[PDB]
Design a protein around this ligand. Structure first.
Ligand SMILES: CCc1nc(Nc2ccc(CC(N)=O)cc2)nc(-c2cccc(Cl)c2)n1
Ligand SMILES: [Mg+2]
Ligand SMILES: [Mg+2]
Ligand SMILES: [Zn+2]
Length: 334
């Protein structure tokens, strides 16, 4: 089994890693083994003097605080966004652009970005007056929680993977990670995309040239957001599993809504679902516009990702036997 797991991990730098197989082979530890592999490959243990046992202990605890019973927002998703961010960081157009600390920030933000997700949306938590929505005053409720948990876990026994960073490095990493994870709040999508467009319009090359924090952090925010919305750009066997998982999670939120006598949210009604038309809409109004802009920023590095996305759209279009539009307006606008 150890030999087979290592053969799968050989694809860690490739778009389309068999992350589900890795989850099976690791005894459901895809986040831990993927993060460890990535930390080794990028020499981040040596650079930031992170003891290996400390890394593993944090990683295992982080992974335990992802909910295994939640169908999509679980440790397998987290592992995937980590690995996708890892690949995007190595695109040719960004060679030598980011420091090691910025790289660590992006990867760490990706690892914690959904930790302790309950499998229901921000709008559900707000509308049911949940404890979390009360704690966070209705704004980026989940994302503020993921951050709080991700950092609090560093305080458990032998979990402080940032113990040998300088005070300035810790502060700077924490500021970046907060900015990145808050930008994963889906309601920020349109503003993020607008800002990414504007940056592409004024971009300078030599490989991209990024002069200031503001431009660098924008690119990292968008990167991780692209990684979070990367499933439809993956090989179709992977995409299809991610779609089945997200619909299961949504339909479960619908069932909770139904039991409380609430109006069933768009995309959450298992009795009135249009899975394939809804993916086509998601790709057309959200994922293709974002990834086309990312592809411009890194031109021509992301051409194959775009082509896969377009092929994957045709497949869902071809398997069709209020809701999309209401879901989009409520989810991706401020
Ligand atoms: C198969 C990949 C996938 N991922 C995401 N990601 C996503 C969208 C919204 C949220 C917020 C939430 N409701 O939890 C979270 C993730 N959304 C979808 C989706 C599904 C149906 C319809 C739409 Cl517009 C989007 N599909
Ligand atoms: Mg999230
Ligand atoms: Mg409580
Ligand atoms: Zn996510």
């Amino acid at each position: 089994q150890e030999d087979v797991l290592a053969k799968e991990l050989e694809d860690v730098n490739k778009w389309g890693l068999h992350v589900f197989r890795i989850a099976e082979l690791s005894g459901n530890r895809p986040l831990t083994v993927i993060m460890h592999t990535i930390f080794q490959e990028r020499d981040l243990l040596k650079t930031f003097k992170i003891p290996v046992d400390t890394l593993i202990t944090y990683l295992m605890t982080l992974e335990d605080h992802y909910h295994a019973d939640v169908a999509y927002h679980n440790n397998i998703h987290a592992a995937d966004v980590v690995q996708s961010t890892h690949v995007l960081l190595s695109t040719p157009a960004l060679e030598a652009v980011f420091t090691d600390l910025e790289i660590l920030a992006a990867i760490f933000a990706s690892a914690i970005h959904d930790v302790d997700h309950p499998g229901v949306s921000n709008q559900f938590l707000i509308n049911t007056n949940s404890e979390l929505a009360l704690m966070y005053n209705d704004s980026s409720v989940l994302e503020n929680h993921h951050l709080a948990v991700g950092f609090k876990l560093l305080q458990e026994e032998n979990c402080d993977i940032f113990q040998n960073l300088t005070k300035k490095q810790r502060q700077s990493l924490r500021k970046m990670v907060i900015d990145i994870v808050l930008a994963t709040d889906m309601s920020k999508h349109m503003n993020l995309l607008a800002d990414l467009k504007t940056m592409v319009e004024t971009k300078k090359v030599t490989v991209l040239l990024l002069d200031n924090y503001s431009d660098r952090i924008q690119v990292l925010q968008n990167m991780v957001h692209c990684a979070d919305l990367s499933n439809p750009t993956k090989p179709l066997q992977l995409y299809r599993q991610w779609t089945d998982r997200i619909m299961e999670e949504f339909f479960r939120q619908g069932d909770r809504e139904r039991e409380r006598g609430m109006e069933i949210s768009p995309m959450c009604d298992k009795h009135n679902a249009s899975v394939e038309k809804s993916q086509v809409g998601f790709i057309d109004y959200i994922v293709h516009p974002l990834w086309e802009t990312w592809a411009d920023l890194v031109h021509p590095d992301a051409q194959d990702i775009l082509d896969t996305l377009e092929d994957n759209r045709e497949w869902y279009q071809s398997t069709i036997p209020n809701q999309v539009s209401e879901f989009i307006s409520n989810t991706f606008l401020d």
